[PDB]
Write a protein that binds this ligand. Structure first.
Ligand SMILES: [Mn+2]
Ligand SMILES: [Mn+2]
Lengths: 205, 205
């Protein structure tokens, strides 16, 4: 079964950028719910229940027809949020090979940011915006609801290994920003954990 | 060109069920944006720019491939919210032919409410829950994002003439209910305008 991961910081550790109230609800209510629903669905599937969540979502097609959607939405939710919590932290700086790769594939850090913001802001409805590694090139993509690039293009409309991502579901920013998603996206740059992003980029898997 | 419709009541007229703050943001920010976005896309489409929004959404397949999605999302948003504002009012009572039809197709009003709540709560991500009329029979269905039964089954996955509907996008209930969508759905019963629902049921078109 999956365990709800604890956060690597206090609920107010991202202030004054991301509000403490949202961090707590987002983690203890929303993420908890996705974990519960995924675990409940996997109860009768011992074989799949043993796999790490990141691996399970790459095999949604091998699941019984009646368990595919619930796991896509909830296991996808668990995987995305787990990655999200670890990808946030104040005081980090983009540098090293990751910075070099971004300037290489996007021309500059500013161009990359503009592209990411465009994808995050244009996602209509609920979804996520991502910086992914496809083979050896970095790219920006967005997915609907709780889909992940790890699920494959056939299912999510995108592919690649997630380096970092931003939750653009309204519950992630409504309490503090209401309809102003663009403001939320801007504040994100102040809390994106570049150290974790660099680590994932190095691993590539 | 489309314009934001004025409300037939004040922003605090649905208290203590729907909060004044949300009513104001929902109308002046969200709905206004759908209207603005739809108008911007229609500027270069003289042939569709002057159709009533309810007519435009039944003809999405006739639109240029590059305009279809933007209008589906924004004209769909304009149509759904316009219907939503008119469908809310305190102090109404379910009765007459509408009540008889509900008891007929659902067994009882309580069974109907249970079915509606289930559909509204089960819609994952952003969407709408509807009570529609099809083949002289009432049915409950839900759609994703800003799709509408009026768009047809091929596009929205549902069909029928909408009698009433409930917005379950998180912006519709997050400020007051946060993650508790079920509580929001229950409060809805206190503000659903049965008089307007009865009128639409009588018209059937
Ligand atoms: Mn989320
Ligand atoms: Mn809405």
């Amino acid at each position: 079964s999956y365990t709800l991961p604890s956060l690597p910081y206090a609920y107010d550790a991202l202030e004054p950028h991301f509000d403490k109230q949202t961090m707590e609800i987002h983690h203890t209510k929303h993420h908890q719910t996705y974990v519960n629903n995924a675990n409940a669905a996997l109860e009768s599937l011992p074989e799949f229940a043993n796999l790490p969540v990141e691996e399970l979502i790459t095999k949604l097609d091998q699941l019984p027809a009646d368990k595919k959607t619930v796991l896509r939405n909830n296991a996808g939710g668990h995987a995305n949020h787990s990655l999200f919590w670890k990808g946030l932290k104040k005081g980090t700086t983009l540098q090293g090979d990751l910075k070099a790769a971004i300037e290489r594939d996007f021309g500059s850090v500013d161009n990359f940011k503009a592209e990411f913001e465009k994808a995050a802001a244009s996602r209509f409805g609920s979804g996520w915006a991502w910086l992914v590694l496809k083979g050896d090139k970095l790219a920006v993509v967005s997915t609907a609801n709780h889909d992940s690039p790890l699920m494959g293009e056939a299912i999510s409309g995108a592919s690649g290994f997630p380096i970092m991502g931003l939750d653009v579901w309204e519950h992630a920013y409504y309490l503090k920003f209401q309809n102003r998603r663009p403001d939320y996206i801007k504040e994100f740059w102040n809390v994106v954990n570049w150290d974790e992003a660099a680590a994932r980029f190095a691993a590539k898997k």
